[model samples]
Target chain A: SATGLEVFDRTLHKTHAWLKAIMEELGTEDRHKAYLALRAVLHALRDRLTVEEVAQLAAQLPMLVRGLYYEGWDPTGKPLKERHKEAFLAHVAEELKTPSGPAVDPEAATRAVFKVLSREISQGELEDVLGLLPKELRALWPQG
Target chain B: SATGLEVFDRTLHKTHAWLKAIMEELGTEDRHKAYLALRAVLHALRDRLTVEEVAQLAAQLPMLVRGLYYEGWDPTGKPLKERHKEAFLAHVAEELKTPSGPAVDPEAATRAVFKVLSREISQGELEDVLGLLPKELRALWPQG
Candidate 1:
């Protein structure tokens, strides 16, 4: 029986393709590099959906992703672009811990959740600047 | 003997623990519900890291985690996250694509790499209600 688990694979591939297409339009030299990195993670987790699940569990992707941002970037003294190494790992640690069962502590979770949100919002703001490029400036994937 | 691939498992577990602790502290009734959903994707990836050959490609973790921010909350919307979703991913795709190689997208990589530091400074420009915390507030973690 194909459980709803199918959503995991379907969404993963869908988002992955969406990311790949977006990378093609970027036209930057590092587009391939960035896409590849993302692909690896996306592919690795393609059968699953962390961000979606968190959103479902929390009823908000923005909030959960934001929680990820806070845990990863809040304490760092640098900007989102220049975050510290240890804190990065700490944020990753915090991000992966989502969906933990009820036995988990609520206080820490609240703080971490917002910490992630703070980072998400900060990055979203920064990305806003780049969003200004004219459409022609984008890249297109080469046909084989 | 631990192969080069085994390291991600080590990293994944560590990251998971950190998230768990923070969530325990900060999570709410609403947040706990969110955590359950969030963990599905994350746990699956954790398993894949242990099971898949792509585990060898985990080198992009640091950079990709950074770029994950660049993809933005809604990069494609009226205000995209940045200029592109895979900007950083494409940059690192070559290295990120290979089991371990150098990234090609420097600007995208640079953006992801520095996002945290940049965001930290951003928070400063925003608000700081720390002083509003009742001086009588007890330390939840209680650092010595």
Candidate 2:
């Protein structure tokens, strides 16, 4: 007997764990806010990585999140020169334009993302990723 | 209030026209085969161009098709030198591995994708892409 098609539960899938991690870090109950922060910070950091560095980071991301990572990427002139904390957070600030407005702090939201990658990605791999950033950006990340 | 959830209606979207164009060109009834060619040639050509070229080609593509354009890109050192016909076809052949083999020719399928792109994308843009390829590879496309 053939079983009928079941709903493709997006939340139940493996990648939800990544979103859950982000939700916990951002101290948000809404998946949409978590989604925004994840996408915002990932893309900000993504544009700052070299093509190879882009690939290596994606290699560690959950599949659907990886889908989110590269949705609209234009990789021609990448690894952008947003080296300092102000420029980097500004890049993250560009996308957090939710109607929810003033509640979100870009620095705090971005720090949440930084900690997520630090915890989720392998220590060795995260080290390579960190090495790509300059000292100013690296100081924003927590100590190992 | 009247309608239950319909099939996601993959065929009705803006990108479905691209598939229909390939379907007609490839002389096939199966959308899957057309889909196969679209993804195969798109990726092969995508990998063969400079990153800027990749972005330009994607701009003309439908959003759904564009989503497919970058599902798994690792842009470290891209636009690979698969310049000759066999080398280029080999990249396509790698993805079209299917039980429906013996029916699909990579060149024929790749040609359909190239032709569809020619019709869908602007002439000047396709010309630039051709300029990037060596003559042997460029010869694969129908005359501009």
Candidate 3:
């Protein structure tokens, strides 16, 4: 459709704003690295969520943001059942790992991204998503 | 136990060299970005293989690489069956998306990473791994 690029352009602008918010949350000048952190945190969290929960979460995201949330998703596993914070963080850490530098602290990064999600999504939706996570993971969310 | 750091350090060095080789193969000067490519390709391919295939592939990785290969891995899904080259490449493209620039071509990137793997991994092992992939995916490998 002729409107395809028009729709995509709008999403592009919206996605940039989301990245800016994430960069502010991360306290980094490098939006590129900030993007990596955001993707790392999102993919880790998304893989851990149930299909219903992930869809609920995606429903709250903007068009482009929702696209990133579902990219490369394979739902056969549905909810990944790693209950401990350690196993959960390990995946986040792997996603954030670089060749030479020290690894980013997964817990801290997860908290930062979750903070962004909290602000962006509806309170009830956030609660529903958090409810699906393990107790330790829920603790990582910042309280209002 | 005493060899913990020693073992870790060795694997660390070896993994670094493998990453370096990948960078060289991709013709990219940035090792950090190169490492990101290695991870993107690895995770994308890993999710596509059977658990048995992954284990076989993992056996050849360095200790650090092996740990990375298994990081956050949820095997309940076993192999993800996208079947088409386009779908498979789309996943890799998502994983490799950067914040500030045009995307690297997923097919070329996959070939570069696979070229490095072909060099680093055993020929017989590589064949076994390649055999599991769809014909389109198998085409990503370099000719012997």
Candidate 4:
């Protein structure tokens, strides 16, 4: 049944493909693994971005994913001082907690998401995101 | 064909439906008529909104549409001084000019686009957009 709004239908199909890539990136059968990875890592990146930078990057995100990126976002004291790679991974790991399945590796999950974003996001926008991270965290992103 | 990004694929489908509705609303097969109408009315309203309000309303718009809204936007000296109904319609008319079609009525086009925005945008976001307009201009919106 159509939702009577085409944008919603398109968003679902779009969100599904995103999860599909997340699955392949992580090489896992668990959809939840992919879902959590996408959400957790997006949160890490979104939290690290300044409010305006977040908006600019978010413009490239599909509608539903944009909502997820903004979920629980509080910009008042934000772009939180998580400049260290460990600090960034800690957030991803904390949020990616799964009830089961061999424990998810935070570094691998973070790297998978960073790769997915690089593929999906334009280089200029990716540069804006990467520019803000300390070299330690930026090192985690795929190198040319 | 894949565009290598699901978000891009999704936005294309989403933006297509939005334009589809814009076409249907004015009861014309002219996609340009709808596109011009959509862009024209959006600019009139966007120019009158505070930059922050514009950003908030924009967040609800799908990605491609949001880019259209922000295109050529300069937040400085904004929320333009067009307060009267005639003044508001004047901006719509100025921007909707088309060399090919029979003369398009700015009022009907404005009403048609406002109708589309209501159908596509949530009531809360619509309220924010509407709240910024003078009652004279606000009267053009669809009444519940």
- lDDT top scorer: 4
Kindly indicate the candidate among 3 and 4 with the higher lDDT. 4
Can you give the TM-score per candidate against the true fold? Answer: 0.23, 0.68, 0.48, 0.61
- Residue lDDT tens for model 1, B1-144: 211123323433443443344334333233332223223222222222221111222222322222222222321123112234243233334233334443223333323222322233233321221121222211111310
Residue A53, candidate 1: C-alpha displacement in angstroms: 23
Write one digit per residue (lDDT tens) for candidate 3, span A36-107. Answer: 666778888888876556666766776545544554556666567788889988888887778875245677
Q: Kindly report the docking quality category of candidate 3.
A: incorrect
For candidate 3, give the lDDT of residue A88.
84
Which segments of model 1 are wrong by more than 4 Å?
A1-131, A139-144, B1-11, B19-132, B136-138, B141-144
* Per-residue C-alpha lDDT of model 4 across residues B1-144, encoded as one tens digit per residue: 333345545665777788788778788887666767877888888888765576677777776576566544555554786668899888889886658543468889888889889889988988877777788877898853
Q: Per TM-score, what order, best first?
A: 2, 4, 3, 1
Looking at candidate 1, what is the lDDT of residue B131?
24
TM-score of model 3 vs. true structure:
0.48
B35: Cα error in model 4, Å: 6.4
Query: Which pairs in model 4 have colliding backbones?
Result: none
**Relative to the unseen true structure, what is the C-alpha lDDT of residue B114 in candidate 2, on a scale of 0 to 100?**
90
Please report, in order, the local distance difference test score of every candidate based on alpha carbons. 0.27, 0.72, 0.70, 0.74
Task: Please identify which of the two predictions, 2 or 4, would achieve the higher TM-score against the true structure.
Answer: 2
Stretches of candidate 4 off by over 4 Å are A1-22, A29-36, A58-77, A90-106, A119-124, B1-24, B29-47, B51-81, B84-106, B119-125
**Model 3 residue A48 distance off true place after TM-score fit, in angstroms:** 22
